[PDB]
Amino acid sequence: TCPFYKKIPGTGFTVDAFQYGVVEGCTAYFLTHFHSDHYAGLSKHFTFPVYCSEITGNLLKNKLHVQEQYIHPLPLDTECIVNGVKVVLLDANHCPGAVMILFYLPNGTVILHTGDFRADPSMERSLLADQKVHMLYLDTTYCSPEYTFPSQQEVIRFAINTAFEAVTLNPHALVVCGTYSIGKEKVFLAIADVLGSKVGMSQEKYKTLQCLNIPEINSLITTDMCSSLVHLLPMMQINFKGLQSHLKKCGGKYNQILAFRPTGWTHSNKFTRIADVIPQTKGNISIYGIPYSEHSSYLEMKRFVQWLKPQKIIPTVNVGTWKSRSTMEKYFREWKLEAGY
Ligand code: NI
């Protein structure tokens, strides 16, 4: 049944709760972003109101065929009224169109649901600075101190320099980047930009990117693989077998592949720096795993919470085991005692 951490008390609202059938007493279903574990269950047959960002609404209409009359897009950074309750959508610094949601309950309680987010100091100057938040429904994906990772800027710098150097040394090398969802577009777009190429991809993925309101996107992507030297493939295909195969398909236009797999975290982060990453190589194929995260590190998450000083925290990730839940609750108590709220 719908878990309690997907329900907003004092309202008939749910968040990211589309796979439970009809949730008894739900008058409005919010969707934070277009990732499959969150939208799971939506289709052209859904007939309740869905509240979301403009970008998420484009994706619901064009990729899932949800009917327009049930899509309610809201602008960001704007006080809006939904079924008599004041709400605001904030940028979550996750994937395109991802939001956090502030609910102002009739009784005076203020609730923030982060959806999926990568905490950033910029959030400390949004409409969040303007009032107190009593309850926080928190993306705890990486809530343990082993999870450190570099800035997104540092990671894109590494990828751009690596690709530029490789292709300048060998003009017959192909760059391949893996994907399985929206998010992390900067990786492939930054590389294509430094190389003066467009990124080539399947028709389904091209359609997905045309939903995202990215400025000048017609200048950066294409469905013509042959005119492109940065290809996007399914993440499943980013291995030596899948890449040797793909190389055959280009008909000797290329003799070398350099591939990037933008992972979340991998345990080489506990030891190694970004400057010291190395690929796995077989023959003329090299695969780089790069730690490009669209979720908070442990320290980024801790700073956000110690800034916000909520009265109660409700985790939304890693809630399935007692040992995970207990460990997270220990970190929350440390944070509160260190900061004095
Ligand atoms: Ni997500």
Side-chain angles (χ1 to χ4, degrees), residues 142-191:
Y142 298 126
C143 190
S144 196
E146 66 271 37
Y147 294 113
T148 55
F149 32 61
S151 75
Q152 292 175 164
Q153 188 266 330
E154 288 176 78
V155 176
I156 290 302
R157 177 90 298 206
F158 171 82
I160 286 168
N161 293 351
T162 299
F164 178 76
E165 172 192 318
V167 176
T168 295
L169 296 172
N170 181 189
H172 304 275
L174 170 65
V175 176
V176 179
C177 290
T179 186
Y180 41 34
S181 54
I182 67 166
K184 310 187 188 183
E185 289 80 9
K186 194 70 173 177
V187 177
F188 55 87
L189 303 176
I191 289 169

Short mmCIF file of all heavy atoms in Angstrom, two decimals, residues 142-191:
data_model
loop_
_atom_site.label_atom_id
_atom_site.label_comp_id
_atom_site.label_asym_id
_atom_site.label_seq_id
_atom_site.Cartn_x
_atom_site.Cartn_y
_atom_site.Cartn_z
N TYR A 142 22.44 9.31 -0.53
CA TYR A 142 23.84 9.22 -0.11
C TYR A 142 24.09 9.71 1.33
O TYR A 142 25.09 10.37 1.63
CB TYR A 142 24.74 9.90 -1.12
CG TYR A 142 24.69 9.27 -2.49
CD1 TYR A 142 24.41 10.02 -3.62
CD2 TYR A 142 25.01 7.93 -2.68
CE1 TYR A 142 24.40 9.44 -4.90
CE2 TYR A 142 24.97 7.34 -3.91
CZ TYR A 142 24.65 8.08 -5.01
OH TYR A 142 24.65 7.48 -6.22
N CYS A 143 23.16 9.41 2.28
CA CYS A 143 23.28 9.79 3.64
C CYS A 143 24.17 8.81 4.46
O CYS A 143 23.69 8.16 5.39
CB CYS A 143 21.91 9.89 4.33
SG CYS A 143 21.85 10.62 5.97
N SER A 144 25.46 8.88 4.17
CA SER A 144 26.54 8.23 4.92
C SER A 144 27.87 8.90 4.58
O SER A 144 28.08 9.28 3.43
CB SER A 144 26.59 6.74 4.56
OG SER A 144 27.35 6.07 5.53
N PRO A 145 28.77 9.09 5.57
CA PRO A 145 29.97 9.90 5.33
C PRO A 145 30.95 9.39 4.29
O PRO A 145 31.77 10.17 3.81
CB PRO A 145 30.64 9.97 6.72
CG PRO A 145 29.72 9.39 7.71
CD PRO A 145 28.55 8.80 7.01
N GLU A 146 30.88 8.12 3.91
CA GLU A 146 31.75 7.65 2.82
C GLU A 146 31.45 8.29 1.48
O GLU A 146 32.28 8.26 0.59
CB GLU A 146 31.75 6.12 2.64
CG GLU A 146 30.47 5.44 2.19
CD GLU A 146 29.56 5.01 3.34
OE1 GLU A 146 29.46 5.73 4.39
OE2 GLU A 146 28.89 3.97 3.20
N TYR A 147 30.25 8.87 1.32
CA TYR A 147 29.84 9.40 0.04
C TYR A 147 30.35 10.84 -0.13
O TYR A 147 29.70 11.80 0.25
CB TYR A 147 28.30 9.29 -0.11
CG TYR A 147 27.83 7.88 -0.17
CD1 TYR A 147 27.10 7.34 0.81
CD2 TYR A 147 28.17 7.06 -1.28
CE1 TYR A 147 26.69 6.00 0.76
CE2 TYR A 147 27.73 5.74 -1.35
CZ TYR A 147 27.01 5.21 -0.34
OH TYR A 147 26.61 3.90 -0.44
N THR A 148 31.54 10.98 -0.70
CA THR A 148 32.10 12.24 -1.10
C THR A 148 32.12 12.19 -2.62
O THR A 148 32.30 11.12 -3.23
CB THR A 148 33.57 12.42 -0.64
OG1 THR A 148 34.35 11.30 -1.12
CG2 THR A 148 33.63 12.43 0.86
N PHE A 149 31.94 13.34 -3.25
CA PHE A 149 32.29 13.35 -4.67
C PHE A 149 32.62 14.77 -5.14
O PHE A 149 32.41 15.73 -4.45
CB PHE A 149 31.37 12.44 -5.57
CG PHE A 149 29.93 12.34 -5.10
CD1 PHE A 149 29.26 13.50 -5.06
CD2 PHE A 149 29.33 11.15 -4.70
CE1 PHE A 149 27.97 13.52 -4.63
CE2 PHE A 149 27.96 11.14 -4.27
CZ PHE A 149 27.33 12.36 -4.22
N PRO A 150 33.31 14.87 -6.26
CA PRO A 150 33.68 16.23 -6.70
C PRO A 150 32.50 17.06 -7.20
O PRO A 150 31.39 16.54 -7.36
CB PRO A 150 34.64 15.97 -7.88
CG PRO A 150 34.54 14.51 -8.19
CD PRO A 150 33.57 13.84 -7.26
N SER A 151 32.70 18.36 -7.32
CA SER A 151 31.70 19.22 -7.97
C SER A 151 31.41 18.75 -9.40
O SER A 151 32.29 18.12 -10.14
CB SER A 151 32.11 20.72 -7.94
OG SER A 151 33.16 20.96 -8.92
N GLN A 152 30.21 19.06 -9.89
CA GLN A 152 29.87 18.80 -11.26
C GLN A 152 30.85 19.54 -12.23
O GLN A 152 31.24 18.94 -13.25
CB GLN A 152 28.39 19.19 -11.58
CG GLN A 152 27.37 18.28 -10.88
CD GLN A 152 25.91 18.70 -11.08
OE1 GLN A 152 24.96 17.93 -10.83
NE2 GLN A 152 25.72 19.90 -11.54
N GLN A 153 31.22 20.77 -11.88
CA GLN A 153 32.14 21.56 -12.70
C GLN A 153 33.48 20.85 -12.88
O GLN A 153 33.99 20.79 -14.00
CB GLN A 153 32.34 22.97 -12.10
CG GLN A 153 33.15 23.92 -13.03
CD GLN A 153 34.66 23.95 -12.73
OE1 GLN A 153 35.08 23.76 -11.57
NE2 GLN A 153 35.48 24.23 -13.77
N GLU A 154 34.03 20.31 -11.81
CA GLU A 154 35.33 19.57 -11.85
C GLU A 154 35.26 18.36 -12.72
O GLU A 154 36.19 18.06 -13.49
CB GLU A 154 35.72 19.04 -10.45
CG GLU A 154 36.19 20.03 -9.42
CD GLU A 154 36.46 19.37 -8.05
OE1 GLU A 154 37.56 18.77 -8.02
OE2 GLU A 154 35.65 19.43 -7.03
N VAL A 155 34.15 17.62 -12.61
CA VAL A 155 33.94 16.45 -13.43
C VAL A 155 33.81 16.79 -14.92
O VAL A 155 34.42 16.11 -15.76
CB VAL A 155 32.76 15.54 -12.97
CG1 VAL A 155 32.53 14.37 -13.91
CG2 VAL A 155 32.95 15.05 -11.52
N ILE A 156 33.07 17.83 -15.29
CA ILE A 156 32.93 18.21 -16.71
C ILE A 156 34.27 18.73 -17.27
O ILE A 156 34.64 18.38 -18.38
CB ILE A 156 31.86 19.32 -16.84
CG1 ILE A 156 30.50 18.68 -16.55
CG2 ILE A 156 31.81 19.91 -18.23
CD1 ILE A 156 30.13 17.53 -17.42
N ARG A 157 35.01 19.47 -16.46
CA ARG A 157 36.40 19.87 -16.87
C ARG A 157 37.28 18.64 -17.26
O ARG A 157 37.91 18.61 -18.36
CB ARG A 157 37.03 20.70 -15.76
CG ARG A 157 38.48 21.16 -15.95
CD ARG A 157 38.57 22.50 -16.63
NE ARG A 157 37.99 22.46 -17.99
CZ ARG A 157 38.32 23.27 -18.99
NH1 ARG A 157 39.30 24.19 -18.87
NH2 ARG A 157 37.70 23.13 -20.16
N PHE A 158 37.25 17.60 -16.44
CA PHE A 158 38.00 16.36 -16.69
C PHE A 158 37.53 15.73 -18.00
O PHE A 158 38.33 15.30 -18.86
CB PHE A 158 37.82 15.34 -15.55
CG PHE A 158 38.39 13.97 -15.84
CD1 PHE A 158 39.73 13.74 -15.67
CD2 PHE A 158 37.59 12.93 -16.35
CE1 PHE A 158 40.27 12.49 -15.95
CE2 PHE A 158 38.12 11.71 -16.65
CZ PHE A 158 39.48 11.48 -16.43
N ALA A 159 36.22 15.62 -18.17
CA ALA A 159 35.72 14.95 -19.37
C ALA A 159 36.07 15.71 -20.67
O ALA A 159 36.40 15.07 -21.71
CB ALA A 159 34.22 14.71 -19.28
N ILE A 160 35.90 17.04 -20.62
CA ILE A 160 36.18 17.90 -21.78
C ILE A 160 37.67 17.80 -22.20
O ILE A 160 37.96 17.53 -23.39
CB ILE A 160 35.84 19.38 -21.48
CG1 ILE A 160 34.31 19.59 -21.48
CG2 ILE A 160 36.51 20.35 -22.44
CD1 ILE A 160 33.98 21.00 -20.88
N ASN A 161 38.55 17.97 -21.23
CA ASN A 161 40.05 17.83 -21.49
C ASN A 161 40.44 16.47 -22.02
O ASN A 161 41.25 16.36 -22.97
CB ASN A 161 40.80 18.17 -20.22
CG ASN A 161 40.65 19.62 -19.86
OD1 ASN A 161 40.13 20.38 -20.63
ND2 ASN A 161 41.00 19.98 -18.65
N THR A 162 39.89 15.40 -21.42
CA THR A 162 40.15 14.02 -21.88
C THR A 162 39.71 13.76 -23.35
O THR A 162 40.49 13.24 -24.16
CB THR A 162 39.49 12.99 -20.90
OG1 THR A 162 40.05 13.14 -19.56
CG2 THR A 162 39.59 11.53 -21.37
N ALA A 163 38.46 14.11 -23.68
CA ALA A 163 37.97 13.95 -25.00
C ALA A 163 38.74 14.79 -26.07
O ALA A 163 39.07 14.24 -27.15
CB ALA A 163 36.44 14.22 -25.07
N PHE A 164 38.98 16.05 -25.76
CA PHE A 164 39.65 16.98 -26.65
C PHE A 164 41.06 16.43 -26.97
O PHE A 164 41.47 16.33 -28.20
CB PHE A 164 39.77 18.43 -26.06
CG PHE A 164 40.51 19.36 -26.99
CD1 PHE A 164 39.87 19.85 -28.12
CD2 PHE A 164 41.89 19.57 -26.84
CE1 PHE A 164 40.55 20.63 -29.05
CE2 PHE A 164 42.58 20.33 -27.77
CZ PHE A 164 41.91 20.88 -28.86
N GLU A 165 41.78 16.08 -25.90
CA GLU A 165 43.12 15.47 -26.12
C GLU A 165 43.07 14.22 -27.00
O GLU A 165 43.89 14.10 -27.97
CB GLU A 165 43.82 15.15 -24.77
CG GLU A 165 45.12 14.35 -24.98
CD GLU A 165 45.69 13.78 -23.70
OE1 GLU A 165 45.68 14.49 -22.70
OE2 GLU A 165 46.17 12.63 -23.70
N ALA A 166 42.15 13.29 -26.73
CA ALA A 166 42.06 12.02 -27.50
C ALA A 166 41.77 12.16 -28.98
O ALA A 166 42.34 11.44 -29.86
CB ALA A 166 41.06 11.05 -26.87
N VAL A 167 40.84 13.05 -29.28
CA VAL A 167 40.41 13.24 -30.64
C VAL A 167 41.43 14.11 -31.40
O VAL A 167 41.56 14.00 -32.63
CB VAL A 167 39.01 13.85 -30.66
CG1 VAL A 167 38.60 14.13 -32.07
CG2 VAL A 167 38.06 12.82 -30.09
N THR A 168 42.13 14.96 -30.69
CA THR A 168 43.14 15.78 -31.40
C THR A 168 44.33 14.89 -31.76
O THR A 168 44.89 15.00 -32.85
CB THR A 168 43.55 16.96 -30.53
OG1 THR A 168 42.40 17.80 -30.39
CG2 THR A 168 44.64 17.82 -31.20
N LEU A 169 44.72 14.01 -30.87
CA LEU A 169 45.74 12.95 -31.19
C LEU A 169 45.32 11.93 -32.27
O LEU A 169 46.15 11.55 -33.14
CB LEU A 169 46.14 12.19 -29.91
CG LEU A 169 46.85 12.97 -28.80
CD1 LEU A 169 46.99 12.11 -27.55
CD2 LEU A 169 48.22 13.47 -29.26
N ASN A 170 44.06 11.47 -32.21
CA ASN A 170 43.51 10.60 -33.24
C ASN A 170 42.18 11.11 -33.81
O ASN A 170 41.13 10.79 -33.24
CB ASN A 170 43.31 9.20 -32.66
CG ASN A 170 42.75 8.18 -33.67
OD1 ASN A 170 42.39 7.05 -33.29
ND2 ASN A 170 42.69 8.53 -34.91
N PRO A 171 42.19 11.85 -34.94
CA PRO A 171 40.94 12.33 -35.57
C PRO A 171 39.97 11.28 -36.03
O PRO A 171 38.83 11.62 -36.33
CB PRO A 171 41.44 13.17 -36.76
CG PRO A 171 42.74 13.74 -36.24
CD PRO A 171 43.36 12.59 -35.51
N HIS A 172 40.39 10.02 -36.07
CA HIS A 172 39.49 8.87 -36.31
C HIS A 172 38.97 8.14 -35.05
O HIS A 172 38.51 6.97 -35.16
CB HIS A 172 40.15 7.84 -37.28
CG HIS A 172 40.57 8.43 -38.60
ND1 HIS A 172 39.72 8.56 -39.67
CD2 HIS A 172 41.76 8.95 -38.99
CE1 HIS A 172 40.36 9.12 -40.68
NE2 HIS A 172 41.60 9.36 -40.30
N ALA A 173 39.06 8.77 -33.87
CA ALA A 173 38.42 8.22 -32.64
C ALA A 173 36.97 8.72 -32.54
O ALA A 173 36.66 9.86 -32.95
CB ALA A 173 39.20 8.65 -31.42
N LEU A 174 36.14 7.87 -31.95
CA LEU A 174 34.70 8.17 -31.74
C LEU A 174 34.55 8.32 -30.23
O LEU A 174 35.11 7.53 -29.44
CB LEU A 174 33.84 7.02 -32.28
CG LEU A 174 32.34 7.03 -31.94
CD1 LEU A 174 31.66 8.19 -32.57
CD2 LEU A 174 31.67 5.74 -32.38
N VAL A 175 33.75 9.31 -29.80
CA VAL A 175 33.40 9.39 -28.37
C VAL A 175 31.97 8.88 -28.22
O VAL A 175 31.10 9.29 -29.01
CB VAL A 175 33.47 10.84 -27.89
CG1 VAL A 175 33.02 10.97 -26.43
CG2 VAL A 175 34.89 11.35 -28.07
N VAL A 176 31.76 8.00 -27.22
CA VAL A 176 30.42 7.44 -26.89
C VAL A 176 30.10 7.77 -25.41
O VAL A 176 30.94 7.63 -24.56
CB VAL A 176 30.31 5.93 -27.12
CG1 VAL A 176 28.89 5.41 -26.73
CG2 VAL A 176 30.59 5.57 -28.58
N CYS A 177 28.86 8.16 -25.14
CA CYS A 177 28.40 8.46 -23.79
C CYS A 177 27.13 7.65 -23.53
O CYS A 177 26.24 7.64 -24.36
CB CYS A 177 28.09 9.94 -23.67
SG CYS A 177 29.48 11.10 -23.70
N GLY A 178 27.03 7.03 -22.36
CA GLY A 178 25.87 6.20 -22.01
C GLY A 178 24.79 7.04 -21.33
O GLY A 178 25.12 7.98 -20.62
N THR A 179 23.53 6.61 -21.50
CA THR A 179 22.38 7.24 -20.82
C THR A 179 21.25 6.21 -20.60
O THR A 179 21.07 5.31 -21.41
CB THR A 179 21.84 8.42 -21.66
OG1 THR A 179 20.81 9.08 -20.92
CG2 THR A 179 21.26 7.95 -22.96
N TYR A 180 20.48 6.34 -19.52
CA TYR A 180 19.23 5.51 -19.40
C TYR A 180 17.99 6.22 -18.93
O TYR A 180 16.91 5.59 -18.74
CB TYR A 180 19.40 4.22 -18.56
CG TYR A 180 20.21 4.30 -17.31
CD1 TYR A 180 20.24 5.44 -16.52
CD2 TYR A 180 20.99 3.21 -16.93
CE1 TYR A 180 21.04 5.47 -15.39
CE2 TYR A 180 21.78 3.23 -15.80
CZ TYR A 180 21.80 4.35 -15.04
OH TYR A 180 22.59 4.33 -13.91
N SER A 181 18.11 7.53 -18.86
CA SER A 181 17.07 8.39 -18.36
C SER A 181 17.46 9.86 -18.72
O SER A 181 18.60 10.13 -19.14
CB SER A 181 17.04 8.27 -16.82
OG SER A 181 18.34 8.52 -16.28
N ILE A 182 16.58 10.79 -18.47
CA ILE A 182 16.98 12.18 -18.45
C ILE A 182 17.94 12.46 -17.26
O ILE A 182 18.04 11.67 -16.29
CB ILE A 182 15.77 13.16 -18.44
CG1 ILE A 182 14.97 13.09 -17.18
CG2 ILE A 182 14.91 12.92 -19.69
CD1 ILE A 182 14.02 14.30 -17.08
N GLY A 183 18.65 13.59 -17.35
CA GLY A 183 19.75 13.91 -16.44
C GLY A 183 21.12 13.78 -17.06
O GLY A 183 21.31 12.99 -17.97
N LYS A 184 22.04 14.56 -16.52
CA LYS A 184 23.45 14.51 -16.87
C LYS A 184 23.73 14.91 -18.34
O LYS A 184 24.79 14.57 -18.89
CB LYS A 184 24.03 13.13 -16.49
CG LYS A 184 23.70 12.72 -15.05
CD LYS A 184 24.40 11.46 -14.58
CE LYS A 184 23.86 11.01 -13.21
NZ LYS A 184 24.61 9.81 -12.72
N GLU A 185 22.83 15.71 -18.93
CA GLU A 185 22.98 16.18 -20.31
C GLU A 185 24.28 16.97 -20.49
O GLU A 185 24.90 16.91 -21.57
CB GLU A 185 21.76 17.02 -20.71
CG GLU A 185 20.49 16.24 -20.90
CD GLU A 185 19.72 15.88 -19.64
OE1 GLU A 185 20.06 16.37 -18.52
OE2 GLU A 185 18.79 15.06 -19.83
N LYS A 186 24.71 17.70 -19.45
CA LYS A 186 25.97 18.46 -19.51
C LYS A 186 27.18 17.62 -19.95
O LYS A 186 28.12 18.11 -20.72
CB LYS A 186 26.21 19.24 -18.18
CG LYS A 186 27.29 20.31 -18.24
CD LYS A 186 26.87 21.52 -19.10
CE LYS A 186 27.94 22.60 -18.95
NZ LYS A 186 27.77 23.86 -19.76
N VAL A 187 27.19 16.36 -19.59
CA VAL A 187 28.34 15.51 -19.91
C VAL A 187 28.56 15.44 -21.45
O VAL A 187 29.64 15.85 -22.00
CB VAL A 187 28.22 14.08 -19.36
CG1 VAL A 187 29.44 13.29 -19.81
CG2 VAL A 187 28.20 14.05 -17.81
N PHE A 188 27.54 14.98 -22.16
CA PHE A 188 27.61 14.81 -23.61
C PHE A 188 27.56 16.11 -24.36
O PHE A 188 28.29 16.26 -25.37
CB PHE A 188 26.67 13.77 -24.15
CG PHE A 188 25.16 13.98 -23.79
CD1 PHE A 188 24.34 14.80 -24.59
CD2 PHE A 188 24.59 13.20 -22.80
CE1 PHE A 188 22.98 14.93 -24.31
CE2 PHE A 188 23.19 13.29 -22.54
CZ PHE A 188 22.41 14.18 -23.29
N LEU A 189 26.74 17.07 -23.92
CA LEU A 189 26.77 18.40 -24.55
C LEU A 189 28.09 19.20 -24.44
O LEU A 189 28.58 19.85 -25.44
CB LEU A 189 25.63 19.25 -24.07
CG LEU A 189 24.24 18.64 -24.30
CD1 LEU A 189 23.16 19.57 -23.66
CD2 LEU A 189 23.89 18.40 -25.76
N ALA A 190 28.71 19.20 -23.27
CA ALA A 190 30.03 19.81 -23.09
C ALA A 190 31.10 19.17 -23.94
O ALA A 190 31.97 19.89 -24.50
CB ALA A 190 30.46 19.84 -21.63
N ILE A 191 31.05 17.85 -24.08
CA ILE A 191 32.09 17.17 -24.89
C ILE A 191 31.85 17.54 -26.38
O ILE A 191 32.82 17.96 -27.09
CB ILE A 191 32.05 15.64 -24.69
CG1 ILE A 191 32.56 15.24 -23.27
CG2 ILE A 191 32.78 14.91 -25.81
CD1 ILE A 191 32.28 13.78 -22.97
#
